[PDB]
Amino acid sequence: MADLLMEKLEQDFVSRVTECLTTVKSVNKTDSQTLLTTFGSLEQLIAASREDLALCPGLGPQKARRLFDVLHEPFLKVPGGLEH
Amino acid sequence: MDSETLPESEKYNPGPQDFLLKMPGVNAKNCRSLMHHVKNIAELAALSQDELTSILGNAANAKQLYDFIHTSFAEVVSKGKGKK
């Protein structure tokens, strides 16, 4: 249950997104808070491009690229041809 | 057998999968099944609440995931129930 409580929903949510951003080696908690204030939602976080991440108030294209991969790369690489 | 249960998980892209593995209503079982059905994390975020419901099987988990993704933590931390 997500809506179990909203007071804890925000807490768990920011927690989950923080690790989400930090899924890449380069992105650390510093960037997490950076993207938090920039986008503010997981939707925009995944929808963010290398440029969207780079335009942030202190990130850098390097971390933006790595996140773009995690945010745009398939799980199984190529299960047949969703991509190639 | 069962959305395929092959030990190929070792070749699955460790970056995007990590983001999925840390999803709210997506648990280890569901995550496996997700990575097998959905192309990537971008897709689960681009799809409808019905789509993930169909894949997860649990309307709740699906809802949690969708609701989480399309909500903004920063806006919840900005307003709502009373913020100062």
Side-chain angles (χ1 to χ4, degrees):
Chain A
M1 295 183 296
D3 304 87
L4 189 169
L5 179 58
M6 63 230 66
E7 306 303 84
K8 294 293 291 299
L9 185 57
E10 55 170 79
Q11 294 302 273
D12 185 75
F13 186 16
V14 298
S15 290
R16 304 301 294 208
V17 290
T18 297
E19 52 174 89
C20 286
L21 314 181
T22 57
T23 49
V24 297
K25 174 82 291 302
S26 309
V27 171
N28 207 270
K29 89 290 292 300
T30 334
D31 186 47
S32 313
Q33 58 172 331
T34 297
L35 310 180
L36 289 224
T37 185
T38 303
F39 305 92
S41 175
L42 196 284
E43 182 192 81
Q44 8 280 209
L45 252 304
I46 164 278
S49 53
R50 296 170 296 218
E51 176 175 85
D52 209 5
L53 303 171
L55 57 73
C56 295
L59 171 50
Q62 55 187 90
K63 282 158 286 178
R65 266 61 179 173
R66 303 191 68 155
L67 262 175
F68 184 90
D69 184 71
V70 299
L71 297 167
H72 296 273
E73 189 68 329
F75 302 110
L76 323 181
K77 273 178 288 185
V78 47
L82 312 181
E83 60 292 285
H84 195 248
Chain B
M1 298 177 180
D2 185 83
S3 304
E4 300 307 272
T5 30
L6 36 71
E8 294 190 90
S9 188
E10 58 175 270
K11 66 178 60 174
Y12 300 170
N13 284 326
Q17 69 168 208
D18 200 68
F19 208 107
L20 176 51
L21 290 149
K22 61 178 37 56
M23 282 292 176
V26 187
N27 42 278
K29 310 201 182 188
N30 284 326
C31 186
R32 191 280 295 192
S33 297
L34 287 196
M35 54 178 64
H36 284 206
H37 285 245
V38 62
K39 180 265 164 55
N40 72 145
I41 27 58
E43 276 286 278
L44 56 76
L47 53 67
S48 309
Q49 212 282 272
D50 302 279
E51 304 293 80
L52 36 65
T53 293
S54 303
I55 309 172
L56 296 173
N58 196 27
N61 284 330
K63 171 284 194 306
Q64 291 176 148
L65 165 66
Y66 183 90
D67 219 86
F68 164 99
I69 293 177
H70 298 283
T71 184
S72 320
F73 41 82
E75 76 180 276
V76 181
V77 183
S78 185
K79 67 198 184 177
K81 49 262 173 52
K83 178 275 181 295
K84 185 183 79 295

